[PDB]
Ligand binder design. Sequence first.
Ligand code: CLA
Ligand code: CLA
Ligand code: CLA
Ligand code: CLA
Ligand code: CLA
Ligand SMILES: CCCCCCCCCCCCO[C@H]1O[C@H](CO)[C@@H](O[C@H]2O[C@H](CO)[C@@H](O)[C@H](O)[C@H]2O)[C@H](O)[C@H]1O
Ligand SMILES: CCCCCCCCCCCCO[C@H]1O[C@H](CO)[C@@H](O[C@H]2O[C@H](CO)[C@@H](O)[C@H](O)[C@H]2O)[C@H](O)[C@H]1O
Lengths: 74, 197, 69, 67, 43, 80, 158
Amino acid sequence: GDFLVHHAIALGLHTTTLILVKGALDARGSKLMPDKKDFGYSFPCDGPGRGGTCDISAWDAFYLAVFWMLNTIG
Amino acid sequence: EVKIVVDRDPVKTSFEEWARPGHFSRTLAKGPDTTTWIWNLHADAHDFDSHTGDLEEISRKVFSAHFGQLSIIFLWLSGMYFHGARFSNYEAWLSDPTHIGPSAQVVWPIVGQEILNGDVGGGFRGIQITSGFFQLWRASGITSELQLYCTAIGALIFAALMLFAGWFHYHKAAPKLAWFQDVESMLNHHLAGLLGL
Amino acid sequence: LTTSWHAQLSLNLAMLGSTTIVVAHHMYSMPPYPYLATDYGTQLSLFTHHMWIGGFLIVGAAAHAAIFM
Amino acid sequence: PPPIGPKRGTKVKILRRESYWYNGTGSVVTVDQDPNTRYPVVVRFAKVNYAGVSTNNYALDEIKEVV
Amino acid sequence: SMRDIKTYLSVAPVLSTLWFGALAGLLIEINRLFPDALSFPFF
Amino acid sequence: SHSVKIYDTCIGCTQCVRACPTDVLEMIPWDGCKAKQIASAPRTEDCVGCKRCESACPTDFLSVRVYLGPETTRSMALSY
Amino acid sequence: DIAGLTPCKDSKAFAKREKQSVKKLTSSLKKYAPDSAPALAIQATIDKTKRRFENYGKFGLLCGSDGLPHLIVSGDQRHWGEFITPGVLFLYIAGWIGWVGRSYLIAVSGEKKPAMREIIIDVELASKIIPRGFIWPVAAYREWINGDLVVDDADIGY
Ligand code: CLA
Ligand code: CLA
Ligand code: CLA
Ligand code: CLA
Ligand code: CLA
Ligand SMILES: CCCCCCCCCCCCO[C@H]1O[C@H](CO)[C@@H](O[C@H]2O[C@H](CO)[C@@H](O)[C@H](O)[C@H]2O)[C@H](O)[C@H]1O
Ligand SMILES: CCCCCCCCCCCCO[C@H]1O[C@H](CO)[C@@H](O[C@H]2O[C@H](CO)[C@@H](O)[C@H](O)[C@H]2O)[C@H](O)[C@H]1O
């Protein structure tokens, strides 16, 4: 049982790190939004064009990561 | 006047369209550029109104699809009656309803799933049902498995009839727009012919 | 009402959905089949099932009325 | 006067950082000969971008000829 | 036609259904022949 | 009020001007493209920030850009 | 033995669990006629249970204080049948599947509209490539040696 629960905890750490790191490294821009740094850390979106751009800022990556943090600590 | 008017041989029965997914849509018939295409193909499938702006064609498609739904429902009823006739303890339940649990589903013995064949009584092991088919069948006067077999066979024949009728009333003889808009006669037939009789 | 399939669908869905809730309420209190009332699992199942079906149909009525508008 | 730009059908590589096809390849369609045109090279690509477009205009210093 | 029916039988959902049905049958028969295995005992 | 800017990759297709719901943009003569015209944004105090103009633009990357700024009665679309 | 564990062929808790399961099955068996189908099904289940316990006992598994088998995956040569050999089988099969998929994608990319061949499979072509997964470890290794497996970083782009 300890083996199984420890591998679950490892899953939590790796996924939370994925979310936060992707937020940090894509902050200045990506292929979908190559000029993101002009808009700042927190902004709502970039509109429904180009397929739709909900939750594209780095602030939103932090917002998503807090859920996984609560899951892991639980 | 209220007259039965149709068009003969509207659509040719062919396998050409089955090999061209997205044929119904002028923007989907090109083929995929992204995965989104695939999802769109399933999302716009039964939206006849967006395929064309012609009311008569929409009505004909609606009629044929309703025939298809009736065929599927008949298949479902045939399955229920056959499983009641072949894999149930209905006959034993007829002699002790308060102490025996109804059951009409049994499982094969692999990977240990046969434990699901529980002790329901009457020398029978299986899964207990809650749909209430046993009470309905008892209220209809059914006392034998042969009668259930006959009902299942009849339902299979009716399902075949509904599917063929869908094919005929779409690809062979399709009613005109004036036929569908006779609401007075439709109300008369469905109030008196269907419900009353 | 003679030129729009969506409006007809909206009205009919609303009526059928409400009727199903009526059926669920009436079948528990006046059990029509023999040996049904004392089969508690069947009674609970039938009531719950028809409640869910009626709710879904009523929601569909609003959807297709919006499509009409 | 000599015609400017690569000839039609040439394969070119994209150097514009903010472009969808950055570091990819495309085919030259035509070149505008007006000296006032700022982005005269028309390039066509096999894959569409996020807006569903498959052609774009570029300047002479944003494309490299690949042999 | 035979060409068209062979084309329709090659579409992705149909081929997936057939492939997974055959694989499921193979696995079920194997588990019926060598049941309740937790290890490889042959060598 | 929001800020709207036009960059010199414009091909003068006029789609953004047709898409705007409060008449912010307009076309003016130019010599840098084959269409001999370019967009302009002289009335940004009436911009609501909807970004339909960005949805209409065909170039890659965009030639018209909208930066949301301080909010006013006109930019919040308040009728009361 | 290893980690304070006990072989399952010498564990009292293991035998207790077997006896309890057999008794539970026999109690149900004693409700039906000897020649009825449910009785035969229960008897077959009992024989299967006894065979399972015997095979677990004589295949060299280890049992804990709870009386249940435990697996050893540290590399000890007395337990390779538990993880290492099935793992080799899993890797071989997975490599076959991946290799044939990659080869189909490479063979089909040369056409005018390759995407049309991804939603409609060319079975004639696929039936010539499927048997070649039989030697995927050799082909992949040789492809890696000659520099045909990987694309240079400079060439990657849409
Ligand atoms: C004899 C066979 C036959 C053939 C060769 C055709 C051929 C054609 N029909 Mg016709 N048709 C037939 C029978 C046939 N039809 C029948 C029996 C009916 C009555 C239901 C109709 C009703 C009908 C309509 C209303 C229309 C056509 C149309 C078409 C065209 C496109 C078909 C297509 O895309 O199919 C490929 C599509 C499918 C295979 C869809 C699946 C259909 C089944 C019945 C659904 C099953 C549901 C499933 C059981 C749900 C559970 C799934 C899972 C969860 C278990 C083509 C000319 C269309 C046309 O001409 O457009 C211009 C059109 O609008 N047909
Ligand atoms: C008294 C005559 C009569 C009867 C019994 C029916 C019966 C039916 N009609 Mg109606 N209909 C009638 C006259 C009649 N209609 C007339 C005169 C018109 C033209 C104004 C229409 C136009 C019409 C349309 C446009 C539609 C229906 C539909 C339906 C079905 C509704 C769903 C239902 O409750 O299924 C209950 C199911 C059963 C009772 C089991 C099926 C029993 C058989 C198949 C009944 C066959 C009835 C039919 C009149 C037989 C004619 C045979 C002859 C032509 C050779 C049902 C089968 C809907 C449907 O689903 O169509 C497929 C539908 O969309 N009808
Ligand atoms: C008689 C009933 C009826 C009919 C004929 C229609 C018909 C239609 N509806 Mg309406 N609708 C109905 C009931 C009905 N509706 C109800 C009850 C609701 C409320 C939930 C709605 C809500 C609704 C919406 C919100 C929309 C429609 C739309 C549509 C159109 C396209 C549907 C389509 O292509 O689906 C294609 C079908 C699928 C892609 C598959 C759906 C599968 C569902 C979501 C899940 C099924 C899960 C299953 C129960 C469990 C499986 C589990 C297992 C696999 C593990 C079509 C005109 C759409 C439209 O554009 O209309 C103009 C649309 O947006 N309908
Ligand atoms: C990652 C999750 C996972 C894992 C690792 C396992 C693992 C296992 N499960 Mg479990 N299971 C899982 C998830 C998992 N399960 C889930 C999610 C469910 C619920 C759906 C179940 C439900 C379940 C049940 C109900 C049962 C198992 C059983 C098993 C065992 C099957 C052994 C077997 O069949 O060997 C034999 C199979 C093979 C050897 C596969 C052979 C494959 C092909 C044919 C090989 C061909 C090779 C070819 C000849 C080339 C080589 C030769 C060369 C010269 C070319 C195994 C210990 C069974 C058991 O006995 O457990 C103790 C069992 O009864 N599982
Ligand atoms: C040809 C098939 C193929 C191959 C060789 C690879 C290879 C790879 N994938 Mg990819 N992948 C595939 C299909 C494939 N993928 C598909 C269909 C999907 C959609 C679900 C994905 C989704 C996916 C994700 C999300 C990720 C990868 C990743 C990876 C890498 C590590 C392995 C892994 O995590 O796999 C895991 C992949 C899966 C479990 C998806 C299922 C793969 C199926 C079974 C492949 C075969 C299906 C195909 C239809 C067969 C066609 C046969 C042909 C003869 C017609 C590796 C480069 C990981 C990565 O980036 O690592 C750096 C990663 O994060 N893949
Ligand atoms: C990345 C870094 C990885 C480091 C991995 C290090 C692994 C070191 C492994 C050393 C193994 C030495 O062997 C160790 O396990 C063997 C079982 O597997 C034991 O062997 C035992 O079982 C054998 C089974 O055939 C018998 O023949 C031996 O008589 C018996 O002693 C050795 O008595 C023990 O000393
Ligand atoms: C226990 C196991 C121990 C194993 C020890 C032996 C390891 C052998 C490693 C061989 C590596 C072969 O591949 C390694 O060299 C290739 C060139 O030869 C490289 O290939 C690269 O250069 C080639 C030209 O030389 C180009 O044609 C390729 O397109 C390019 O990818 C691979 O990108 C690199 O990964």
